[PDB]
Amino acid sequence: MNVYDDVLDATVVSHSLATHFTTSDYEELLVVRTNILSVYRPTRDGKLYLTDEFKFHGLITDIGLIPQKDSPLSCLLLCTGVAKISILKFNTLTNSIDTLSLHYYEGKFKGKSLVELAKISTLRMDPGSSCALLFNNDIIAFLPFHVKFTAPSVVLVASELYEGAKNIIDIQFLKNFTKPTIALLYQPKLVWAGNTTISKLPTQYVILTLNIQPAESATKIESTTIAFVKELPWDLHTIVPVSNGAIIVGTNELAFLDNTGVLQSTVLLNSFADKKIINNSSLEIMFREKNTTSIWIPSSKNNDETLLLMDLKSNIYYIQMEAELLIKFDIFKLPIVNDLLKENSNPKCITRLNATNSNKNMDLFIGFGSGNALVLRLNNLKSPFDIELLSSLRNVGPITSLTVGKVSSIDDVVKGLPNPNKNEYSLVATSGNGSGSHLTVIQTSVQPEIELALKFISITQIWNLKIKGRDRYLITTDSTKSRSDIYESDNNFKLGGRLRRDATTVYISMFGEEKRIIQVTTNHLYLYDTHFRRLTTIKFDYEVIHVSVMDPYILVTVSRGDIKIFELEEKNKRKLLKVDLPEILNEMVITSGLILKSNMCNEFLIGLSKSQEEQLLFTFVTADNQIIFFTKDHNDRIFQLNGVDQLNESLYISTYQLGDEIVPDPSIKQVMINKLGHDNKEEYLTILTFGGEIYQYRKLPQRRSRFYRNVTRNDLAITGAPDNAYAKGVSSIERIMHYFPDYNGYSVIFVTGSVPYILIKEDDSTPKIFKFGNIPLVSVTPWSERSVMCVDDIKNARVYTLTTDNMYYGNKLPLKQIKISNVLDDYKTLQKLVYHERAQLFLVSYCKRVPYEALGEDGEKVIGYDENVPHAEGFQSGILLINPKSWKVIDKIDFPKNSVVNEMRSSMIQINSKTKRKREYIIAGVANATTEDTPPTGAFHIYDVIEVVPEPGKPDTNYKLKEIFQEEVSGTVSTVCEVSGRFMISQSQKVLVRDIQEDNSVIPVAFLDIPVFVTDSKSFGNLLIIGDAMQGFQFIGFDAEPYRMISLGRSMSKFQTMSLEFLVNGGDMYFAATDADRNVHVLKYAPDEPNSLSGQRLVHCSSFTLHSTNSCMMLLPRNEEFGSPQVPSFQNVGGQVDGSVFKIVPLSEEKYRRLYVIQQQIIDRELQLGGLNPRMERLANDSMRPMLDFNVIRRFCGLAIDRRKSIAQHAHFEAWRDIINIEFSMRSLCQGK
Amino acid sequence: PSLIHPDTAKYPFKFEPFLRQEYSFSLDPDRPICEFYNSREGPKSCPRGPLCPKKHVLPIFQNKIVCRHWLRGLCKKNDQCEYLHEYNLRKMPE
Amino acid sequence: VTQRRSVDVSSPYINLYYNRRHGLPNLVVEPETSYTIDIMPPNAYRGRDRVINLPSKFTHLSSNKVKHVIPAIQWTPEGRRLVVATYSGEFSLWNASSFTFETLMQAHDSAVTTMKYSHDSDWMISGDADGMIKIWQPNFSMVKEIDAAHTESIRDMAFSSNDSKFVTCSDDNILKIWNFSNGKQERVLSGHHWDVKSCDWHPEMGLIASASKDNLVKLWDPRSGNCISSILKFKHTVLKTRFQPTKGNLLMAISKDKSCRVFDIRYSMKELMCVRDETDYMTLEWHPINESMFTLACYDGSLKHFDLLQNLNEPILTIPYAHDKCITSLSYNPVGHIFATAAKDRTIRFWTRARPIDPNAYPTYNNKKINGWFFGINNDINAXXXXX
Ligand SMILES: [Zn+2]
Ligand SMILES: [Zn+2]
């Protein structure tokens, strides 16, 4: 009984298409991460600015654009998991995606395939824009279009299309044909390197000119066979269509097959290809991908077309063409002399984003499955060309491993004062898969760099002032002691007089184009010159609470609820004038008012209608929750943000109408429309609830009157709860938002409280709240240029400025790229990172992909020994000890060739069994990854991290890995886990628990025969889950005094297990084991149940289809924020190959049943994006109590407050108080020792 | 708390009473060997019985020399074996 | 100290659960033997690369020292050992790790006609040339020696998907579904006018196929003793029957007649491929991980590997002189990496997956020593075909 939340949302760019979708104005680069479709508008500078982000409940397997009639903005087509086409029109009015048609094929496909369907059902679009096919493995769906939107869809096996076509290698639609044409590249007899000796030239390529004849009930498909090619290289895997005809990108051979059929020319790419124009290339390049990414660009204003192909090793290959007959056919590796694609690998999708009406000087986005998804600019095309990294989209690679560890809190005191992230751990990933692989510190909190830190006495609110841009005068105040003392630039008091120093000031700021100073003290407003002297004083009958300032205006809200707006007399700027505000709001009950300058309701105004200029409008929040506003020249015509009392997805501005619908339920404490992001300063209405809940609406560039928030996208995590739930986050320090136009270029909204939040928009993403340090924050003030001073609850003010050097502020959690692979040595691919608390430092096992040497136990190579050919990628591992204070690699302990540290864990192994002195040792399970027929070699390497004398120059190098014990043992050491003071390592089908003695003599003590290979092992005290590579997993108890590895329960459903890990939730324990089939299986050990057979058969209670193969699942404690922790509960934080990080946070059976009522009520009542029912989606074939997609629960959080309270089936509050318990489960990382 | 490796041997389970009855294995790994218990009789010797907080050594585990058959995962006598079912090199005939 | 041919998937699985743990896709192997690292372990390959884990490379011939006629062959589901039945009535146990025999268990009083492990990968039913069957632990200890299993010698065992009940068949015309946990027969299967030569249980749904000398496969229901459909497509006698152990979507049945058929339980009991070999087929086994891939074997040896998505009319890979004599029994380890097969020549041959380059790949009729020292430290060897 669990919830699944993406802690870090997916980031690996799998698919991307640059065609008008959101807006017809600019060419929009849609980018599929894996479940998150994000629409970017590339600028002339290249930087991708996100217009609209969409989170689909289900993996976007493949995407394409089909143009729709009557409208310029082209419809989208995405595939969800195994064969599930979703047609998507972007509705301009709602600014969200509506499904035109959903097409389930998974059912129809199983009824045609005799084999299991391939997980990645690949989609193909036709250039004629008439029929888009979806093929799995020899089985094809055809989705025709009328030129309703979609014609009734057919499903047919390739044997129905062509007489042969026995197993499809790749289909692609071909260029320039009147009626649409597929080109089925297939093998009748299947052939790999091994079948090559008997079957020669055994790939058949057939072009079939389809006759898509659609009837309104069901379509009939007859395929005219225009061309049949019989004898082609076995390796031909990808068909890429070019105007003259298809290119076939094979592993070793690359054959151009024209539209008429006959092979015009083929290029032998390397040494492995052999066969009619033959082109022999000695440049040993190979396309070892099953489907190689390839950007084909047509000619414009011409006979100049380009096709670029990409190796997995991330090399661009421009292929030359001459359409006439075909001459000039050769591949060319583009000279990447400035290695910027070195940091990337596994290119998944290339797309040209800027058309420039010319084939040369192209800007193209390449999405990578490893490195950052780069936007390149190719400047020329030669057979003075230079590529440049025009823009970057941050990709957290495949998150190879994941471990909690202190990256901050390593310094207990920084700049004198205590650390902002004191007693704060953060789960650090190992992103990247290649020469640009890097530790990614997936931080729970924004780690802010301190410029200046000073201790303060008896203060609560700070107001620094920049008299001429430079900060010169700082103001401190106290609510309790009743005093407001004024500091300086060098932080010295009374520098300076005539202030209301004896009473609590509420607001002090620059005024009248940085000449005057307004001090609003509780009872008396004041006006000052640059040098402080009282010029104008305004008295009030009631105590001033809410107060805002723009350049020529002050607004004050008194204790009664009455508001007063004041304008500066601009002619001399001395005295103050009362603004004749509309009398309509005097009857209204105002909670908080803010002066605002944005072009939000300028369309509704009589002056500058459709002009786009920031008219100064005074926003207010009514007690019945609606943002009312007006300009100075209002003429009693007041505007409102309509539908905030419900706070629904759309948020249009209209004229305010007063009646008797007044329900004083205040839930908008602070509201602000602010430009956000370092480059693309997008306006954002940002509601803050009295329950410390932040809602954030976007001002839409088209129709600026209408505001909209992506409810489906879970960008902003829930900071609070509306129905007084999570009161702990609001009752301590009052939640007040502070907008800063420049914090480090980045425009942010700081949110003060016990838990501080920072709304950071990056260009790459929707603006996200992040936890701002572990420390509480009382009040923020903008320190001298691109810096913000923040004061602690303990009154320790620190000038912070966000790091941008390697940080990224999308992915719904702030993350720090740590490139430890520097210039002098690149540790390509970082695997199985582990933190070591006894030394407070990280260990990561690098694994350089060495040229593999195929040899037995003897030094002689196996008989197929060839040196001229390019060798296969083997393994050359090694551990790096990294001290995270400096993040320099301290100690490199390399391993022999063919060796790879499959798993490495820091333990608490017992040194003496009687004494129970658990010294923290790391154990690296290295395995000599070799051929199947070579004897399996492996070694477990145990390391004690010792305080060594540091090198005279650099500090932090005061630790070195000490090889206390290593043993090159029979069988592959594929996993290590510390089972209660003893560590088990895997072997070939064996698991030996080793015990470490005080003499460092390590003896195996307990033994267990496992089914075929351990992928992953985890221990929960003296329990174990030893994951069998295809035979599910053994759940294993472990005894000591008589060392018995007692087999407790095999997983009944046997599956290719990916990463095991426990999730306990009290009482009976549950195990999450992920699959090769991207599927979490939660199995509980229930020996109480009779069907479970004494526990020996684990009851498979929940399956949950992920959006990626879970690379490393990892247990860490969860923060029970609302409730009290009687039993230490553990959530389950798993990485993803798509660069997501999920939490399988488990729940109480009461707690879950509340959310499962919500989930089932959200899916049914509220519509999803691609029409995809998440409960139906997150299921593949191995109890009716499913794991909950929190991505669909946080839709309840994004839901309209009226409908939200309606969905309660006393329980609404009880729901919220545990929805926070799921989102705040990661905040356990903010508690140390 | 201690977030980086909190494996926690002292976690309470619903199957903790079961694992004392069957398998003779409690959630405390290196718990002491209980007094007033002999392997020859079984649960009848101990006053606490099967739900004993301390551990119960089986006749197979107090046996001297290790099993060659169990070491290769195929001993006919899974219980009442004249050899040991504990893989320690101290008690080994090579 | 002494080196031996060690076909062990553990090393490739690392290479897999690295490539899978980084999303670095299953790299297409190139002809040169360095690429043998990227031959990922069988269940890594599905679809247009299944032909990789199709077993063609002769690995090892072994004989049980005493040289006895093997009645049945079944792998221990963990993939670790191959259990070899004996006409003497013993379980010879050739492990996968080295192709060396572990101790003979001496199972039954007479010859063990068949043995089969549970899908829970623990228990195994054996059988006899007398009536009896025995329930075994994976560590081989006779849990329930059911003496009065059948009036005649049993023929084939098969477990349910939940392995809570299993089917026996015999030289008696009737089948018995035994409720496994009690060791008593739940429902008897009244049908077939002649002896039930073989039977198999569908590995997902409740369905039991039954090869009979009545030349028909009746498809029984476990809940009630009646056949839901009787396939009448066979002519002489249905010799054996199986399913795809993975999905179960395809039932298969071999004949003592030249014919052989593969069916769909999914689609109205339709046949897909009526393959006829001039030399009569004897035994079949589906590739344990790759649906629509199996191996038939003939009276002329002829280890004929097939695919339902490559050639319906034809075998994919013929090994025409695999064994000297008629192959009686064959099984893949559920891993898929080794495919063991035994004949009435009293020798059990193991067949691994191919390795991208070897001159002895495709051997074809070896005169004196077909088992000519293949454990010589290395996988691949040069050429005529036999060594020493
Ligand atoms: Zn006792
Ligand atoms: Zn024994």
Residue numbers in the entry:
A (entry chain A): 1 to 147, 193 to 320, 326 to 351, 358 to 380, 383 to 441, 496 to 607, 610 to 1296, 1303 to 1329, ...
B (entry chain B): 1 to 94
C (entry chain D): 27 to 388, 391 to 411, 466 to 470
Task: Pull verbatim passages from the article behind this deposition.
It is reported to contain 15 different subunits, including the Ysh1/CPSF73 endonuclease that cleaves the pre-mRNA, the Pap1/PAP polymerase that adds the polyadenylate [poly(A)] tail, and two protein phosphatases (Ssu72/SSU72 and Glc7/PP1) that regulate transcription and 3′-end processing (1–7). Computational analysis revealed a protein–protein interaction network in which subunits are organized into three prominent modules centered around the CPF enzymatic activities: nuclease ( Ysh1), phosphatase (Ssu72, Glc7), and polymerase (Pap1). The poly(A) polymerase module contains five subunits: Cft1, Pfs2, Pap1, Fip1, and Yth1.
Next, because of the central role of polyadenylation in 3′-end processing, we developed a strategy to overexpress the polymerase module in insect cells for structural and biochemical characterization. In our cryo-EM map, three of the four subunits are well ordered: Cft1 (residues 1 to 1357), Pfs2 (residues 27 to 411), and Yth1 (residues 1 to 94). Cft1 forms the core of the complex and is composed of three seven-bladed β propellers followed by a C-terminal helical domain. Our structure reveals an extensive interface between Cft1 and Pfs2, burying >4200 Å2 surface area. Yth1 is anchored onto the complex by an extended N-terminal segment that binds in the central cavity of Cft1-BP3 and continues across a hydrophobic external face. Next, two of the five Cys-Cys-Cys-His (CCCH) zinc fingers pack into the interface between Cft1 and Pfs2.
